[PDB]
Ligand binder design. Sequence first.
Ligand SMILES: [Zn+2]
Ligand SMILES: [Zn+2]
Ligand SMILES: [Zn+2]
Lengths: 240, 208, 51, 102, 195, 114, 97, 255, 163
Amino acid sequence: TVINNWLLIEGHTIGIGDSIADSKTYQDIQNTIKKAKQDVIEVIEKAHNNELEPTPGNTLRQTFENQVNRILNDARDKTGSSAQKSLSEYNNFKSMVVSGAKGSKINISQVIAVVGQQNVEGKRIPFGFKHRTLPHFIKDDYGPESRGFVENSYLAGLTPTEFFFHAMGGREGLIDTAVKTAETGYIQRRLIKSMESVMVKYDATVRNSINQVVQLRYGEDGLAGESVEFQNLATLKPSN
Amino acid sequence: DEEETYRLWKIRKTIMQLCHDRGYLVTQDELDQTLEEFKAQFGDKPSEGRPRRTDLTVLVAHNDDPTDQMFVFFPEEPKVGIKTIKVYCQRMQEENITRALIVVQQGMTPSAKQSLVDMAPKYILEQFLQQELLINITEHELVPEHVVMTKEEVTELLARYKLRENQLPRIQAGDPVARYFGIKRGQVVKIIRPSETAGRYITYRLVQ
Amino acid sequence: IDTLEEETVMLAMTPDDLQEKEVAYCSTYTHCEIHPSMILGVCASIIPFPD
Amino acid sequence: AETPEGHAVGLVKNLALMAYISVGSQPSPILEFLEEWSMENLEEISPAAIADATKIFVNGCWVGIHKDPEQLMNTLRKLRRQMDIIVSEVSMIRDIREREIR
Amino acid sequence: YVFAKKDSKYAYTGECRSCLENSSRPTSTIWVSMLARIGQRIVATLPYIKQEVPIIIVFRALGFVSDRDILEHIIYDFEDPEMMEMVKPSLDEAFVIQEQNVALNFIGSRGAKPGVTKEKRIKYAKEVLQKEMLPHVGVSDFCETKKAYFLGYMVHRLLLAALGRRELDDRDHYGNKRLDLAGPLLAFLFRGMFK
Amino acid sequence: VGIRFCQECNNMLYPKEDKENRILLYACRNCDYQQEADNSCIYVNKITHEVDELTQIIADVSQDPTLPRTEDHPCQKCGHKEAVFFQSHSARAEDAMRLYYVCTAPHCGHRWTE
Amino acid sequence: DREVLRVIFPTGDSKVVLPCNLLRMIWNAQKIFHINPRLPSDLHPIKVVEGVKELSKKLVIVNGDDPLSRQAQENATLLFNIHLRSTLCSRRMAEEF
Amino acid sequence: KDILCRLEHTTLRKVTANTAIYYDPNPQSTVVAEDQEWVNVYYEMPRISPWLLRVELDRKHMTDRKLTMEQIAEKINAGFGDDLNCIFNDDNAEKLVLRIRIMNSDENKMQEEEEVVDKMDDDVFLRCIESNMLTDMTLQGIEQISKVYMHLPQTDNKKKIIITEDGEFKALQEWILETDGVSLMRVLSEKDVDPVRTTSNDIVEIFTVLGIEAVRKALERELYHVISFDGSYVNYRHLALLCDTMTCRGHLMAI
Amino acid sequence: KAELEAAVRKKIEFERKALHIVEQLLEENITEEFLMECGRFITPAHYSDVVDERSIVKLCGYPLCQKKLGIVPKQKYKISTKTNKVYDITERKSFCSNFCYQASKFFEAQIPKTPVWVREEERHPDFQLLKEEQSGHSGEEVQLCSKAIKTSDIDNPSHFEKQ
Ligand SMILES: [Zn+2]
Ligand SMILES: [Zn+2]
Ligand SMILES: [Zn+2]
C-alpha cells in the first residue's frame, strides 16, 4: 500500500527511448556484430580450405558447428552486456531489471542489442530446402545470416528472413511449453500419490500407511523443514 | 601368468577383509599383504605352479570362541558341482566346523545351489563368484557401514521402539552386502551413515 | 511457384536491393518476392509492426 | 505466426495471403507436347541410353527420357509463361544433380 | 519416398503411394526395403500379399527372366561396381526361380486367398501385379515394361539412398504434401454414393 | 568386384574353383558356361572407403542458379575465370566440408577440388 | 569435532542447514542489550563453556535414559551441537561477539 | 588413455581397413605380389584351403588401442583354434595385414551326406565366416561400453578433494573417464580404476552390484543432480524421504 | 492342505530331484530302465544340471557312457569342411564322444515338458514318453546316424523351394 501510493506521487512508465541507446552504444553493438560476422567468415574459410582440425571427440562438422555457435553466442552476450551497461539511471528498463522485478536482462538485450541465434532442436536453423535454409540463400551457406542469426534488435526490426527464422525458433518454445506442462503434471501426480500417507507419528517416527518405519526421525534429525536455515560451520574451512 | 596371480591375490585380500568383517580372527599382516608377499608365500606362477587354487584355502576361527571356525574353499575346477561340494562337506565333518565359503569362478547350477542350501542346519555353505570378490564393495563410496545386530541387541531395539520386525525397512537376503556379511532371514542389519542434516544416522533393516 | 519448384529457384526479396550490383552475393537470381509481408496470414496481417 | 495454442499447436495452420492451392489439371496436353518435343518413351529406348539422359516424370509416372533437358526446361517455362499448352499452375522441377525433370 | 526405418528389419525403405488419374480405387502403397545387417537383400512389400517378396521375384513375375534384363532396369550404368555389389545379394535369394510362371506362383502363394490350383494362384498373382501394383503406371495387359521400369526406379533410388548418394526424404517438406479441399473431399465422398 | 554375366542365358556368373588346374573359374548355374577369370579376387569390402567425389558430380550442375559462383579459381583445363563451388553432402563424406569446383564454361565442365 | 566434520563433509562445503541462526541471535542479543564492542566484557569464559554444555542437554530430539536412545540423541544433534560449540566458543564470545 | 582403451569395446570391424577374399591356391605363388616374401617366412617349414581372406587393418587404429596382430591371432584361434589359420607380418613393416585360411577337416568324419545337404561353396563359406568374425572378435573392451570420454573435470564435484597436511582442503584435478553403457561390476574390478568411487547413473546396475543402501544413496544423488541442475534447490529432507519410501522394502520401487 | 501340501510335495520333490541328480552322477548302477524311471522325474533344466554336474567330474554327461573326458578343447567354434558349417562346441565339450552328445540331446528332447508338479499328474503320457525315450536312446546306442554333433551357428538365410 505505501508503495502504491508513493508511486502515485512518483509514477513509473515504459516507453520508447528506454529501448533506444546512445550513438556510442549503437556503434559498439554494430562493431561487435561486424566482428562476429567476419570471424565466422574466417572460420568458414578455414573449413573450406581444410585448415580446420577436428577437436578431439565429435567430428569436423561438429567442430565447425561448435566454433561458430561459440562465436555467435559470444557476440549476442557481448551486445547484451554492452547495452545494459549503457542504460542510464533514468531508464526504466534498468528499473525493471536491477530489482529483478520484471523480465530478464536477456529480454532487454534483445529489445536493445541483438536477438541473436535462433535454434531448432539445439542446432542452428536446419537446411530445410535442398541445401539451403530458405530459397533466398545460396546453396551451402553457413554464414550467420543463412542459418538463423538475427542481428537486429526488436527496435530496429527483423528483416524478412530473420522474421521467419525467429518464428521457426520461437515455435519450439511454444511446443516445449506444452510438453513440459504435460510431463510436469504427470510427475507431480505420481509423486503426490506415491508419498501421501507418510506422516510423522506421535513417537517422532515417520511412518507410512502400513504403519512401517520409513525414517526413525523426520529428515533424520527430527526438525521441521521450514524452521531451518543456511549457516556456515566455521570449523570446516580454516587450516590447522 | 602374472594376471591370474593378481586376481588370486585380490580375491584373497577381499576374502581376508570379508572374514575380518564377519568377526573372524584374521591377523593384520595377512589382511594387508601386497602382491610381492603373495608371490613369495604362494609362488606368483598360477599355471604349472605351486600357487594353485587349492592350497590357498583359509581356516579362520571366530573371535568369541575359537571353536566356531570357517573355511574358504577355492576349488580348482572352473565350475563346481554336487560331488565337490559333498567332498567339501565331508571334509568339514572332520575338525568339526560348520561354516564354509566356496569361491567359484563360473558359478553353480541351480540344482547344485539347491543342494547347497538343503545342508541347512549342520553345514552352512555359501557361494561367491570371483567377479564379485575382485573388489570390496563395502569400501565403495555409496555403501554405508553395516553392522550385524546380535539377537539381544535387536530385542532391545524392538523393545525400545515398540516395533515388530515387520515394521522395519527391509534388505534382501541376497543383497550384495547381505551376502557379504552372511545374513539370513530374520537377522537385522544396522546401517550407520553420515547425514548432512543431523551428522549421523543409524537406520535398521530387516533381512527378508 | 510451388513448394518443390521453389527449391530450384533463386529468390530475391526486393529488386531495389537484391539485384543491384555490389560485392556479389548471388547474381543469378531467377525470381523476386512481390512483397515479403505476403508470407503472413489473415490474422497476422492485422498486427502492426510484427517485425 | 498463426497457429492455435495448447494441444493443437502447429497442427492447424493457415494459408499465407497470396498462397493458392492448385485445383488440378490434365497431363494430356503436356504428354503430347513432350512426345512432339523429341522425348523418347519407355518402350522405344535401350537401357544403355537411359544412363546419361534425363528422366522425365509427369505426375509421378516416369514417362520418358530426354537428352537435352536444359533446352526442354527453357521450352516448358516459355510455354507456361504464355499459357499456351501448360496452364499456369503446372509445376516443373529440374533435379540437375539427380538428372530428372518432374 | 526413401526413408530410413529406425530399427525394424529394414535399413532403408522406399515407398510409393500410387493412385490412378481419376481416383477410381484408393491409393495402394508399395514398399521396397533393404534388410539390415551373403548381404543386405532387397524385399518388395506388395499390396494384397502378406509376406515380403524378393525384388528379383517381382521382376521375374513381370517377365524379365534373365539377369542382365533385370539390372538394366535397376542399374543404368553398369560401370558402377559399387552399386552392382548391392544387388548381388538379391540376385541370389531369387536364384532358384528362373522363369516367369514359377515366380508368379511364388507370389500368389502369399496372397490373401491362397488358392488350391497352381494355375489359379498364378492368375491371382497375375492380376494383383496387373492392377494393384503401381496402378499409376498403368492398369492394362501391356503395362509391364513400364512397371518394370518404375519398380527398377524405386530399387535404384533405394540403392542411391543406401549408398549415401541421395538425401533421405523429408517427411515434413511441403513439396511432399497435397491439400484436399472441398473438391477432392467431395469427389471422394461422391464416388461412394454413386457406387 | 564387378558382375560377370553369362553369354548364353545372361544370368550371373558365380565364381568356382578349378581343381585339375587349380584356377579360378566363373561358371553359370543355368548352363555349363565357364570362363577362366582374370581377377583372382572374389569379394572386396572397403570399410574406410576413401571415395572420389570428383566422379559423382556431373558437370550439369554448372547450370544451377542456386549454386555459388566464383572468379578467383580459374579452370585449369580451359582457363575460364568462373566456377561453381559446392560441398559433398553425402552421408559417407558429409564429415568434411571440402569445396569442389565445376568449371562453368560450356563444353568444359571440368571438376576439381582444392 | 572438526575431525568429525571433515568426515561428514569430505568435499569441504561448509554451508549447512540447521535449526537456529546463531549468528543472528548473537546479533539480536548485541542489540537488545546494547552491547558496546569497545569495552571489556563481563562474561566469564568458564560461563560460556559451562552454559553451552548445559544447553546442549536441553536440546533433546530423542528422549533418553537408554543406551540406544542416548546414541540416537547424540546422532540426531551431532551437527547442530558442533555448530553451537564452535560459534558459542569461549574465544569468540570474548573477542568477537 | 591406456585404461580407456582397455575399457572400450574394440571389435574387428573397427580395426579393419578392408577385406578381400582372393583365390590363392599355392601360397608360394601368392597372387598378391606384396605378401609373397613374408609368407614363405611361415612356409620355410610350417592341408590348406585355396580361398584366402586377406584383411588389411588400419595402422593408426592399432597404434591407438595398443593392439598388436599377435593378440588378434590369439583372439581368433581362441574362438576357432587351428581350425582357421591366421598369418601376419611384422609390425615394423607398412600396411600390416592378416591372411586367414580355413585350414581343413583332416581325414576322419567320413560317410556323411555333405553334398546332400547342399553345402555352401567354399567362398560363400569364407564370406559368412568373415561376417561372423568381423561383427565381433572383441579384441578389447567390455562389450557393453560403446564409447569412452577421457577428460579433466573442472567442477569440484568430480575432483579429488584431499586435505593437505597443513590442514586445508585442496582440489586435485585429475583424469576421469565417462563411458557410455554400464558394466559396473566388470569395470570397477580392473586395475587403476578407483573402486571406492566410480559410480553409475543406472540405479538398477548399482542395486545389483552394491546393494539397497548404495542404491538409496545413489538414487538421492541422481535426484539431487536432476533438480539442482537448473540452479534450483529442494531441501534434503524431501529427497531423503522420497528415496526412503522408494527403497524401504528391500528392492527398487517405481512409484 | 492346498498350498501347505503344495510346499511339502514340491520340497520332497526338490530333495528327490537332488538324489535323482546324484544317481545320475553315479559312474554305474544306472541301467537303461533305471535311466527310464529317472528321466520319468527329470525336467529339461534338471537334465542340463545332470550333464553339467558330470561334465565337471570329467564324466560323460550321458548316463550310459562312462568314458572319462581327459582333455577338452578351448575353442568355442569348430568349423567343418566336410559340410560347410561352423558348429558351436559349447555342449559337445560336455561329452566324450559324439554319439553320446546326440543321445543325451535326443533324450532331453524327449523329456516331459510339463512341470514336475503336474508331471506325475498323468503317468499315461509319462510312460508313453518313457518307452519313447528308451527306443530313441537305443537307436542312439547302436549308431549315431549323423555327424552333426555341435548344434549349428546358422547363417544361411537363402530359401529353397519355398515357392
Ligand atoms: Zn548361363
Ligand atoms: Zn573449364
Ligand atoms: Zn559319452
